[PDB]
Amino acid sequence: ASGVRLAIVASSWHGKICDALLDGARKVAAGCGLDDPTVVRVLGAIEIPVVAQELARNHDAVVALGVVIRGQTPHFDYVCDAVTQGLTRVSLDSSTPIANGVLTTNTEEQALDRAGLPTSAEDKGAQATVAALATALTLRELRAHS
Amino acid sequence: ASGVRLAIVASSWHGKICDALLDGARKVAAGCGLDDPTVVRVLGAIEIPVVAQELARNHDAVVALGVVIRGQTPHFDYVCDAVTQGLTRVSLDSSTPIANGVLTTNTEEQALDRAGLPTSAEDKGAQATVAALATALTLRELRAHS
Amino acid sequence: ASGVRLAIVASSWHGKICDALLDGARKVAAGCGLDDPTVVRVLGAIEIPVVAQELARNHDAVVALGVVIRGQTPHFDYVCDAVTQGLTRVSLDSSTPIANGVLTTNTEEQALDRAGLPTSAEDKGAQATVAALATALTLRELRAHS
Amino acid sequence: DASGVRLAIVASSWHGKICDALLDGARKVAAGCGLDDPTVVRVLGAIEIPVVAQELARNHDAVVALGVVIRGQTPHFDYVCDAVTQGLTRVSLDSSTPIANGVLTTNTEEQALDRAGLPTSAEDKGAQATVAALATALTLRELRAHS
Amino acid sequence: ASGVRLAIVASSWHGKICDALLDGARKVAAGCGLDDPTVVRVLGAIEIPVVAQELARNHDAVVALGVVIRGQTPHFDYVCDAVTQGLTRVSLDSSTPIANGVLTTNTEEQALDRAGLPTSAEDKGAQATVAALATALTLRELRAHS
Amino acid sequence: ASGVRLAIVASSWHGKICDALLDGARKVAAGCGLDDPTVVRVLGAIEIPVVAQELARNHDAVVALGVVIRGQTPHFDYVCDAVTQGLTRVSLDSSTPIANGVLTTNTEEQALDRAGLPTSAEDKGAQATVAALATALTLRELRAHS
Amino acid sequence: DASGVRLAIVASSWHGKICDALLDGARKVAAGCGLDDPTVVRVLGAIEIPVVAQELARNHDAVVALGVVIRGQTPHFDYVCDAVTQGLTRVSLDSSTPIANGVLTTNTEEQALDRAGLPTSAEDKGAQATVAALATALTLRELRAHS
Amino acid sequence: ASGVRLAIVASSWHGKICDALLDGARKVAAGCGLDDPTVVRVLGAIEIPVVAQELARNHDAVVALGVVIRGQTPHFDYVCDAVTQGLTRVSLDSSTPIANGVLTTNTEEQALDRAGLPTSAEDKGAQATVAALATALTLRELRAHS
Amino acid sequence: ASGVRLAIVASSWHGKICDALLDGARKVAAGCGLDDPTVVRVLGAIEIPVVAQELARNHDAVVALGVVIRGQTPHFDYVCDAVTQGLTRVSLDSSTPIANGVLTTNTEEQALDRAGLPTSAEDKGAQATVAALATALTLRELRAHS
Amino acid sequence: ASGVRLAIVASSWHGKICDALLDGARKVAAGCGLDDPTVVRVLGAIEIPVVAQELARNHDAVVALGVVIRGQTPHFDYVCDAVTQGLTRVSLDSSTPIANGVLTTNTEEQALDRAGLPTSAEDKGAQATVAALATALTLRELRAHS
Ligand SMILES: O=c1[nH]c(=O)c2c([nH]1)n(C[C@@H](O)[C@H](O)[C@H](O)CO)c(=O)n2CCCCOP(=O)(O)O
Ligand SMILES: O=c1[nH]c(=O)c2c([nH]1)n(C[C@@H](O)[C@H](O)[C@H](O)CO)c(=O)n2CCCCOP(=O)(O)O
Ligand SMILES: O=c1[nH]c(=O)c2c([nH]1)n(C[C@@H](O)[C@H](O)[C@H](O)CO)c(=O)n2CCCCOP(=O)(O)O
Ligand SMILES: O=c1[nH]c(=O)c2c([nH]1)n(C[C@@H](O)[C@H](O)[C@H](O)CO)c(=O)n2CCCCOP(=O)(O)O
Ligand SMILES: O=c1[nH]c(=O)c2c([nH]1)n(C[C@@H](O)[C@H](O)[C@H](O)CO)c(=O)n2CCCCOP(=O)(O)O
Ligand SMILES: O=c1[nH]c(=O)c2c([nH]1)n(C[C@@H](O)[C@H](O)[C@H](O)CO)c(=O)n2CCCCOP(=O)(O)O
Ligand SMILES: O=c1[nH]c(=O)c2c([nH]1)n(C[C@@H](O)[C@H](O)[C@H](O)CO)c(=O)n2CCCCOP(=O)(O)O
Ligand SMILES: O=c1[nH]c(=O)c2c([nH]1)n(C[C@@H](O)[C@H](O)[C@H](O)CO)c(=O)n2CCCCOP(=O)(O)O
Ligand SMILES: O=c1[nH]c(=O)c2c([nH]1)n(C[C@H](O)[C@@H](O)[C@H](O)CO)c(=O)n2CCCCOP(=O)(O)O
Ligand SMILES: O=c1[nH]c(=O)c2c([nH]1)n(C[C@H](O)[C@@H](O)[C@H](O)CO)c(=O)n2CCCCOP(=O)(O)O
Ligand SMILES: [K+]
Ligand SMILES: [K+]
Ligand SMILES: [K+]
Ligand SMILES: [K+]
Ligand SMILES: [K+]
Ligand SMILES: [K+]
Ligand SMILES: [K+]
Ligand SMILES: [K+]
Ligand SMILES: [K+]
């Protein structure tokens, strides 16, 4: 667990939630032996993929965190298409896991309930970190040694 | 089908259903003379393509197993989108069959019914493996030999 | 149109319906004086693109045939997306017409009706092959000759 | 402004009368811009456009894709539109050439006829896509290397 | 961000709204030390991506601006899908931020309200440029220096 | 061998010698019952690969013909290297036999002798076309047929 | 050790008797390793090898390229060797498959005959390249994903 | 040849000889109806390919001009190697003719004799432009038109 | 360099000399905190590059070791050219250092003298590994951290 | 001149000379307005390309400096092939000038005479910096603005 190189890129739109997701990703990392993951912040979720690409050049895994919440127009749908499309492509070009902990909810109560705050049902920041670390460890054993 | 190299990557969300899909894939595999395919477990369906890309380096077919079930948010559609996008890409980049045996249902009852348990109407795990072995055999013939 | 090298790949799901699409593709091919076209069967529509990729290496045109009918879950939508992204990409990678003769219907009744039986209103199987051939001829002309 | 740009136009043939009317719009815009002999290729359906457009983009500064997809009783409209879309988008970026999407996607015949620039049409989408191709080809020429 | 090299590409459909979004982009650029960003016009949203690609070859970031408003037909969906797939591909291919300020609304009232016209609630032009620049700045810090 | 689509590209430097290589290529093509092959002239051997690239898009085989004779400077060596790297690469990119019928001689006398005139000991022009054709036939067989 | 590896061998035909002797070496090594039916294709000259090898590498774990290039009076030896070399090297790395270079490049016929594993030959380069292909195919299988 | 877009990139080492090569290219250009080709000067032959790659984005042909002359070290061969390698690559990646008009001599007298000055035996500058225009015309014809 | 992930690939031709170079690589690795580098053998130099490529997928650097000694024929030139082009391509494709410790000598005395056998003047195995590691370390510092 | 982003990678083999080349590159840079170019050291010249590749991701130009001197074996030739081949490829993948100031001499007096020391005939470190800066400035004017 301890020897993996991990990066976390978190957007800042709905900053409060963003910070709650990043809290659960860090804590997961630190309990697995990783106290100094590369952490980067971006403004919005659309900026995540290009930053994830840069990070995957020299980390074993990248955790993509953020919060998108449906407004009054279709813009929500296109923002979510673009992030889904970018992350999948970056993982496969780089042959590196890019864990998707980007929340996509209709409401703010949904996001708060998915973010690992004191009374949340679940913590997606923490789940996405477990996923990336576990997957990087699986790739390690599949690949060439020794 | 004795001499095809088969790999099965199954995710672990709704882990009771995933084990049943894997069970049917493993039986189909063993029935066509493959007693020990390469089997890999990942956490979540989203992780399937990058592990499947690696497995395709060393195998003639890959079977992607898992279960995504719809909740209260739009997340179900972006998860399903990433899986669909990623596997098709991997199949064409590697010119290797990747069978989609990832169930995408609305309810848990629908998934239970397509995982090949005692009272289930079908087994997609089994169908996914059938399709992957069949295609690998076809390509073998289509491609260069004596 | 006698000069063109034509492959047909037909999936087998709803095999009565796949079988009329294919009868109609071969009628059209024979009526344009074709050298016995290369025909490959596959299990499901999701299998078609990797086999089309193989076939496109050695032919001027590939007709993709099969049938997808909608059920009780979202699966239909992902199956159709996969086929669509796959064919479009295979055709551009190989710069080869990949005709889409893949029905995507709500009901069995609608599919039977577009499959060119005596009482059917349309025949997608035959339409796809005319399309294939015309596009191959056009590209012959557009490309380098004396 | 566009006397030197090499334009190609590819038009599908489903709904013949409307494709003719899109192509007339395209050739008029071209003519008015100094271009009398654009390369023009016909294909049978709109799904065939992208692979013909890709070929046209090797010898041309801009490609105009014309056609008409009209929704039926099945979901099949949605997949055709998806293929066309994804393809022309790949083709333009692979080749670093404008590929103007002049392919109508309507719910009914009435709607298509209204966007093909017939005498009483509200608009002419074939015209629009040519202007768009030609103006993007010119933009890119100034942007690109000259001395 | 005075040493950042910025380009801005604005489509022209709905001229008043674009001029406004372009004006917001440009006021944000000047307010962060950038007097002469490269500014290019195209007619429609869909032309943005190929122009963006030429601009990503010697700028640190590109802002996409334009307006898509829904009508009576399906065409809106395909315009937005095109723009989204295009700009997502352009950014990762060139490893350069393309900030998306393409408005995608159901109504004109909605679009005018997001354009930073005098009575508007927000300006997505202004917002897109803040994103471009922060991201450029982050990449700079992340990349090779010494 | 009647089925194969053959292009010949011959450079024009030492045109008497290029002209016998080409007469010998066409004799061989006609003696295998060929549909009038596509013939293109180019000015010099360095021109051949880009034109071969174009020709390989629409043919099963390309014969490259021309003559390079050594002079007083190192130029000869670079001209021959260029042609070599170009042809080998064009053939692999297009997976198409690109026969090398390009003489590379110290003197004019040696070239005339390998160019298949009555008193010549060899004919490289004719050798290259047999090679072209045989390789195209072999690949037809190796690839996907019924 | 190599019962499960799928081996292809491509051999050029210039200097027929020596190519036969290289191919005999290859098929013996294969047989002794559990492999009785390697895919074997003949091509006319060594410059044809790379494009045939590339095709063989889509359906096979290893390719053995056999042949014989013998220096003449002109510089033309040097370019043939260069093409063969560059090609088999590209083909192996593009396809992530071993392509064993069993192509002799000699100054005289005497030298080639000495490296084709005839009864009095000093060595058999056809044998060597098969062992090399098969041992690299096996290496890469352990290195690659298994469970 | 009126409507071919021509570019000439000349290096500046042995600048008297380079200007003479350029002079012959410019006259050939002007003779076939091209009065203002794109002309670019670089310092050294090694710089030619990356500028030529850029010029190929916007032109149908490119002419590479320059003069490398052998000194006391092996550097002459690696300079010549890089030029040869780089230009061939650029020509095939861009599917655009790049005429090699870079003289590679042993002495300054040999270069003076191939640069098309009053008493020179030939003009390579002129030949390089001839070859590039001729090839661009050929490809135009080979490629798609009415 | 304790956190560097190293692989070493040593060919086997001239077994005593390779064992020696491999021993030098391995003593340098241990002397810089690396107890278990991944060590793989291949038969000949030419097999190095495809193995190197598999190893570059999860190591920070790869050391190539082997011995090529010149004989009576041209073959030596083509073995060295192969190895050089292969390893150069493998490093840039994978953006990973491949340190070249493939000895290329005219005589056996020469090779034994560069192998760090007991009486040797140098050890190019030892040297190649110092290069691998410094370069890994430099890239680490140059790449994304925070 | 002042706005270009410049990197210099210098190997350390023949350290004295290496340092004399780097002195002339820095000084050239500082007189052009560039006081803080990114400077990286590598052990040998073979390590230069992979470091040059990393640097070209975010600089307008890279200057490659070093010294190779022929010894007793052909190793010199292969070291020089690999550097020539790597640098040309890195410049073209990145569309960035990579100035070659890697000296290749038969002797040490030749190197000292090419390195810009008090009594040298020439300074190649300084020439290669002028070349890269001048070329980057030329690309700036060819490319997109304003
Ligand atoms: O050609 C097909 N038509 C269909 O209607 C269908 C197919 N294939 N497949 C699966 C097939 O393409 C692949 O072989 C698998 O992914 C394994 O890789 C299908 O699964 N279907 C059924 C489509 C919808 C029906 O069911 P539900 O009620 O579960 O929504
Ligand atoms: O240009 C077209 N417009 C249309 O409206 C349409 C086309 N083409 N095609 C087929 C064509 O693009 C391809 O030639 C084939 O797919 C073969 O590759 C169509 O099939 N359509 C009809 C779309 C909807 C109508 O019917 P339904 O009632 O079954 O949904
Ligand atoms: O910037 C745009 N905004 C829009 O709202 C719109 C554009 N462009 N375009 C077309 C343009 O990007 C392309 O230049 C062409 O396709 C040719 O290449 C649009 O067609 N629109 C309108 C979007 C839909 C409205 O209406 P109805 O559905 O009623 O026709
Ligand atoms: O993380 C985000 N969450 C959101 O909810 C949201 C973001 N980002 N962005 C934009 C951002 O990713 C990019 O920074 C820009 O496009 C510029 O490149 C958003 O625009 N949103 C809002 C999505 C929906 C709500 O609004 P409306 O009421 O206008 O539909
Ligand atoms: O396998 C070969 N061995 C050789 O020694 C040789 C071959 N092929 N070829 C040609 C062959 O590879 C290709 O079929 C053609 O080039 C067409 O693409 C040869 O030409 N050779 C002879 C090399 C040297 C002899 O003669 P000269 O005296 O003219 O230099
Ligand atoms: O590591 C090696 N060292 C050498 O000195 C040598 C090798 N390999 N190989 C072959 C090997 O890398 C490849 O496995 C095969 O080509 C098949 O793929 C060699 O052939 N050699 C010998 C180099 C030349 C000597 O001799 P003569 O010129 O007298 O035959
Ligand atoms: O086919 C050719 N044969 C030759 O012998 C020769 C050619 N072409 N070319 C040039 C040609 O391929 C290109 O068209 C130019 O690069 C322009 O792009 C030649 O230059 N030659 C002459 C080869 C050597 C003679 O001369 P010197 O005495 O100068 O060494
Ligand atoms: O900059 C260098 N100059 C040289 O003269 C030289 C270097 N590097 N290298 C090796 C270096 O680039 C790499 O660090 C290693 O291969 C490991 O990757 C050298 O080996 N040399 C010496 C070149 C020739 C002299 O020796 P011989 O007497 O053994 O022929
Ligand atoms: O296999 C899965 N099935 C599911 O149903 C599901 C999964 N995975 N995942 C996780 C992703 O595969 C995961 O690995 C992350 O993206 C981290 O990279 C899920 O998040 N789900 C839930 C989808 C639907 C449920 O709920 P709401 O919309 O109510 O939130
Ligand atoms: O056009 C050139 N002609 C030449 O004869 C020559 C050039 N350029 N260059 C420079 C490269 O194009 C240059 O741009 C650098 O590599 C920096 O990137 C040269 O260095 N030369 C000289 C080659 C031969 C002379 O001498 P010695 O071997 O005696 O040192
Ligand atoms: K990585
Ligand atoms: K939390
Ligand atoms: K595979
Ligand atoms: K089961
Ligand atoms: K076959
Ligand atoms: K084809
Ligand atoms: K029928
Ligand atoms: K073009
Ligand atoms: K009209």
Ligand SMILES: [K+]
């Ligand atoms: K410009």
Ligand SMILES: [K+]
């Ligand atoms: K950029």
Ligand SMILES: [K+]
């Ligand atoms: K505004």
Ligand SMILES: [K+]
């Ligand atoms: K950094």
Ligand SMILES: [K+]
């Ligand atoms: K071909």
Ligand SMILES: [K+]
């Ligand atoms: K003849």
Ligand SMILES: [K+]
């Ligand atoms: K393989």
Ligand SMILES: [K+]
């Ligand atoms: K033998």
Ligand SMILES: [K+]
């Ligand atoms: K492994």
Ligand SMILES: [K+]
């Ligand atoms: K061009």
Ligand SMILES: [K+]
């Ligand atoms: K002149």
Ligand SMILES: [K+]
């Ligand atoms: K043509």
Ligand SMILES: [K+]
């Ligand atoms: K690596």
Ligand SMILES: [K+]
């Ligand atoms: K040692």
Ligand SMILES: [K+]
């Ligand atoms: K750069």
Ligand SMILES: [K+]
């Ligand atoms: K100096």
